[PDB]
Amino acid sequence: VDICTAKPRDIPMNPMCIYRSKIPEATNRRVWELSKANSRFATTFYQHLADSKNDNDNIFLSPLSISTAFAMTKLGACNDTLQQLMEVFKFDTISEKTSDQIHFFFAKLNCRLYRKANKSSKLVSANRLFGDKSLTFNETYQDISELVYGAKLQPLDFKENAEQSRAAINKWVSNKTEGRITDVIPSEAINELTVLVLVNTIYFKGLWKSKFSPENTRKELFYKADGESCSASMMYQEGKFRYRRVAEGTQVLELPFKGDDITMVLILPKPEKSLAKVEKELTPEVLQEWLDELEEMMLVVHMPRFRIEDGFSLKEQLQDMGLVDLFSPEKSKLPGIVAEGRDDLYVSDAFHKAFLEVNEEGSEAAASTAVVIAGRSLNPNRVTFKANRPFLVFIREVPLNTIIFMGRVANPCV
Ligand SMILES: CO[C@H]1O[C@H](COS(=O)(=O)O)[C@@H](O[C@@H]2O[C@@H](C(=O)O)[C@@H](O[C@H]3O[C@H](COS(=O)(=O)O)[C@@H](O[C@@H]4O[C@H](C(=O)O)[C@@H](O[C@H]5O[C@H](COS(=O)(=O)O)[C@@H](OC)[C@H](OC)[C@H]5OS(=O)(=O)O)[C@H](OC)[C@H]4OC)[C@H](OS(=O)(=O)O)[C@H]3OS(=O)(=O)O)[C@H](OC)[C@H]2OS(=O)(=O)O)[C@H](OS(=O)(=O)O)[C@H]1OS(=O)(=O)O
Ligand SMILES: *[C@@H]1O[C@H](CO)[C@@H](O)[C@H](O)[C@H]1NC(C)=O
Ligand SMILES: *[C@@H]1O[C@H](CO)[C@@H](O)[C@H](O)[C@H]1NC(C)=O
């Protein structure tokens, strides 16, 4: 039956290699743990990423999507490759059983995230495997991915139609993300020696609990660091919201969607202060403190009606975060993928692309993560606009305390 009600002993799926080792009501402790882990990676990754970008740049990702995809990749890992994945993604900072049962509890967390009855806001996810038509993949490997991640294996012809296969993958990702994410894998990323491609997609579309009125939305010039300008449709509202002015005058505002199950957190540093201090001290612990301090208050909310998108490769960051072997054609270990015992597999490169849009009605967001086993290790775009005065955005799920999307909006103009 569905793994949303099953227990580890009901369907004890056997992974390739074994790892070398209050809370909310009606919530299984271990699922809560997984949330802590994923959040511990969310914050950490952002810090490395925000470190490799100009403070006046937009940043937008879905740590959830990245974690899900890499946990999927973890099925075929083994030895030091596996040890690295566990550590980097915080899968080792939890109890023994949960650590040794990641996939199953990820299935459970996901069940809670996307299969929750009576859903006021739309949150859906889709996973998928794309493998070369000529190879013979491990049956158990497929079965477990399909069972736990709902990721079926679609055969594509990378061997002779690499580029065409790429467009196919992207078209699938667009389909799942409502046409928001249409180009996750860059051109020439996939080539003749490509074996498999693991993909995850997350899509959120909710309505504000307290919507904004378009007759109050105005326009004003936004001044960029360089000296230029652009038009920004600044939304206005007045109502009660959980707010809190913290250390050094940093404002924290929460915008709950219909149902309060999911909410948007906005962190605005002091009127003429660097967000850098905030970002550097970003820990799930601090994030929790802020939200715990928020007190429902009456206030005037001003926020731009905008749209941002951010796409990038994950290789550089993850390596600087501990993941080395997985990308090394000499030290990588992925024995549990193809039945042919081809233990020469390595992840060539990984990509991510997110989308964010906000208006008087609500906020839409989509994200994807494409992991390519064997291919073209290219270095994507190294330049994007640097506007000015950015604020941090978080799209979290209240009960599970999970960070769905997270980023920094530096350019609100469109
Ligand atoms: C070194 O020690 C470590 O390893 C050993 C060996 O494990 S091994 O099997 O891998 O070798 C561990 O010992 C095993 O673990 C036990 C455990 O409870 O964790 C036990 O597991 C099995 O039985 C438990 C209890 O079942 S019971 O229902 O009969 O009591 C079971 O856990 C329950 O799962 C429920 C669930 O539905 O998931 C929980 O319900 C709550 O959550 C649901 C929904 O959650 S979610 O949607 O958020 O996901 C909610 O419904 C909406 C409920 O609402 C009513 C919630 O209940 S409420 O009361 O909280 O409101 C139960 O409550 C939390 C929960 O009980 C704790 C477990 O399922 S699992 O947790 O999903 O795995 C089940 O797994 S099984 O498949 O293995 O059976 C094992 O007994 C068989 C036990 O093996 S033993 O017999 O050899 O000891 C060590 O665990 S522990 O330390 O002993 O706890 C482990 O240590 S640690 O990992 O370091 O902590
Ligand atoms: C398939 O993977 C499983 C672990 O999930 C392992 O038991 C088995 O040896 C593998 N079979 C192969 C590579 O043919
Ligand atoms: C995605 O494909 C399904 C059929 O599987 C169809 O219902 C839907 O309209 C498609 N969505 C797109 C192309 O955005």
Three-state SS letters, 3-35:
CCCCCCCCCCCCCCCCCCCCCCCCCCHHHHHHH
The finding on whether 76 has its CB within 6 A of some atom of ligand 2 is: no
**Do 299 and 312 belong together in one domain?**
no
**Residue 390 falls within a domain, yes or no?**
yes
Question: Using CA atoms in the order 270, 395, 119, 99, what is the torsion angle rounded to 10 degrees?
Answer: -130
The finding on whether 312 has its CB within 6 A of some atom of ligand 2 is: no
Asked if residues 257 and 207 have their Cβ atoms less than 8 Å apart, the reply is yes
**Do 322 and 286 belong together in one domain?**
no
Specify the DSSP element, H or E, that contains 328: none
- Which one-letter amino acid corresponds to residue 234? M
**Do 170 and 68 belong together in one domain?**
yes
**Do 240 and 323 belong together in one domain?**
no
Please say whether the dihedral angle defined by the alpha carbons of residues 287, 289, 292 and 294, taken in this order, is positive or negative.
negative
**Residue 396 falls within a domain, yes or no?**
yes
Specify the DSSP element, H or E, that contains 166: helix 158-176
**Do 256 and 389 belong together in one domain?**
yes
Tally the domains of the chain: 2
DSSP 8-state assignment for residue 186:
P
Which phi and psi (to 5°) does residue 311 adopt? -135, 145
For residue 310 the two structure tokens come to: 């951010």
End-of-domain residue from the set 340, 360, 380:
360
**Do 39 and 115 belong together in one domain?**
yes
User: 3-state class of 121 per DSSP?
Assistant: coil
**Residue 173 falls within a domain, yes or no?**
yes
**Which atom of ligand 3 is the closest one to the Cα of 179?**
14
What separation in angstroms does the CA of 404 have from each of 45, 119, 124, 262, 304? 14, 16, 11, 9, 21
End-of-domain residue from the set 338, 360, 382:
360
What separation in angstroms does the CA of 147 have from each of 2, 71, 113, 292, 389? 9, 14, 17, 37, 45
**Do 53 and 118 belong together in one domain?**
yes
Asked if residues 301 and 266 have their Cβ atoms less than 8 Å apart, the reply is no
CA distance 59 to 275: 13
Ligand closest to 172 (CA) is 3
**Do 239 and 348 belong together in one domain?**
no
Give distance in angstroms: CA of 175 to centre of ligand 3: 6
**Residue 310 falls within a domain, yes or no?**
yes
CATH number of 398's domain: 2.30.39.10
Give distance in angstroms: CA of 337 to centre of ligand 2: 8
**Residue 3 falls within a domain, yes or no?**
no
**Do 174 and 320 belong together in one domain?**
yes
CA distance 157 to 166: 10
**Do 77 and 128 belong together in one domain?**
yes
CA distance 255 to 396: 10
Declared resolution, Å: 2.9
**Residue 15 falls within a domain, yes or no?**
yes
Q: Which string of DSSP letters, residue by residue, matches 333-390?
A: --TTSBTT--TT--EEEEEEEEEEEE-SSEEEEEEEEEEEESS------------S--
Give residue for tokens 């065409």: 164
The finding on whether 15 has its CB within 6 A of some atom of ligand 2 is: yes
Q: Which residues are annotated as a binding site for heparin?
A: 32, 112, 128
- Strands 229-245, 122-132: pairing is unpaired
- What is the span of the domain harbouring residue 276? 208-303+366-413
**Do 228 and 323 belong together in one domain?**
no
Ligand 1 pocket, CB under 6 A: 7-9, 26-31, 95-98, 108, 112
Specify the DSSP element, H or E, that contains 109: helix 102-114
Give distance in angstroms: CA of 35 to centre of ligand 3: 31
Give distance in angstroms: CA of 85 to centre of ligand 2: 19
**Residue 1 falls within a domain, yes or no?**
no
Residues near 369 by Cβ (< 8 Å), separated by ≥ 6? 62, 65, 66, 68, 69, 70, 184, 199, 200, 314, 350, 351, 352
End-of-domain residue from the set 328, 345, 360:
360
Q: Where are the beta strands (DSSP E) in 166-294?
A: 196-207, 218-223, 229-245, 251-256, 262-268
Asked if residues 137 and 339 have their Cβ atoms less than 8 Å apart, the reply is yes
CA max distance for the chain: 64
**Residue 182 falls within a domain, yes or no?**
yes
**Do 136 and 53 belong together in one domain?**
yes
CATH number of 71's domain: 3.30.497.10
